[PDB]
Amino acid sequence: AFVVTDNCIKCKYTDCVEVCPVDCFYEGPNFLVIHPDECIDDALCEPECPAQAIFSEDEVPEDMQEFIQLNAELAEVWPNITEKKDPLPDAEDWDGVKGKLQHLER
Numbered sequence: 001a002f003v004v005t006d007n008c009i010k011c012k013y014t015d016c017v018e019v020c021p022v023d024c025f026y027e028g029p030n031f032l033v034i035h036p037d038e039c040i041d042d043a044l045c046e047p048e049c050p051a052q053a054i055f056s057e058d059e060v061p062e063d064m065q066e067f068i069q070l071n072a073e074l075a076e077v078w079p080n081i082t083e084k085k086d087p088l089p090d091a092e093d094w095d096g097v098k099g100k101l102q103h104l105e106r
């Protein structure tokens with residue numbers, strides 16, 4: 001019930017996965033999502049994200065409410081990621097840029 005939002009796109013640091021007790025993170029080309037049914041809400045991944053893109057479902061910003069359903073539907077099609085990887089090459093350039101959902105890759 002924790003949701004990855006907008007600032008993850010084009011950053012994808014992947015520090016979030018090393019602290020997940022249940023391995024419920026699924027990866028896309030430039031984005032990660034959380035499988036809402038497997039997540040146990042221990043909140044351990046939220047302070048680990050450099051993009052600060054992870055939020056508890058009831059705390060997801062009003063203008064990013066879309067990502068709640070997005071994480072559930074993409075967690076169903078993307079592959080499981082359980083290990084840390086290097087961030088995307090220009091992650092710091094995109095950290096803090098808004099409306100990055102227009103750059104989301106399936």
Ligand code: SF4
Nearest residue numbers: 020039040042043045
């Ligand atoms: S809140 Fe806990 S169980 Fe849910 S995705 Fe984050 S680390 Fe994994």
Ligand code: F3S
Nearest residue numbers: 008013014015016049
């Ligand atoms: S940028 Fe994305 S890959 Fe994890 S560390 Fe943050 S939710």
